[PDB]
Amino acid sequence: GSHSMRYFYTAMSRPGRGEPRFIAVGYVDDTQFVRFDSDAASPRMAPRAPWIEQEGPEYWDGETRNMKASAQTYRENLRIALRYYNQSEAGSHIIQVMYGCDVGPDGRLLRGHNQYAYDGKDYIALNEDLSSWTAADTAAQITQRKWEAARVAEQLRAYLEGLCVEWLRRYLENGKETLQRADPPKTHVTHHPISDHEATLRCWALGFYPAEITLTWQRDGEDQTQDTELVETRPAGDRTFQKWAAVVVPSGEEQRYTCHVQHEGLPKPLTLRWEP
């Protein structure tokens, strides 16, 4: 199928408590494979998936060098942002960065991404053309002007179309046993009366990978979106994910309701009902 590589950086200032913490994580699809944390005793880019462990010392040394340099740059960026927003040195602030590439089944680039946030709000983003910027406000417009002058977009484009895709393809091959295996959800429906008049039907999906899934309830074949309680998809801790969807139904009407499950690991969408 299609695949993605993403890096996520978080830089968090903490006045009076040392320099800002910098944490980077790297993902292929829904699998984390590297981490870096400036608060570690010995900060290093470190492996978090079995298939990256085979990379040699040049990889780990160069990625560690890059993360250390990035932490210094994002500490500077936090100081710069204070100026651009006329803010005091007393408060804690956060810069976040996401970037990476999406490839199709053929390994061809589908699109790149490179976006930034300040205190949880959009700041600046590289547009899909990988050549122009969208700034959220007049502060980020100052960064935009600086980055236009320095032709930053050209450097990011070269990375996103080149090394990003090439290394994603390498990881997908080295990790094909897991990264290229979809685990379908294990499903069941539970039933719990809530009163003499009503009962809860809960449709469960467990053990699936990747995280993307659709769980829906229908009544007489019509989707029940407004009456369905959906929990966020959640990690089990063994690489897989879990999700459930519940509806409250009139006693005796249970067989009017069907749960529908779509997942990449299923050849055909599933239809489930409560089986008493």
Partner: peptide
């Protein structure tokens, strides 16, 4: 593989 740093804000 991670991206090199770019210019600051």
């Amino acid at each position: 593989l991670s991206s090199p740093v770019t210019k600051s804000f």
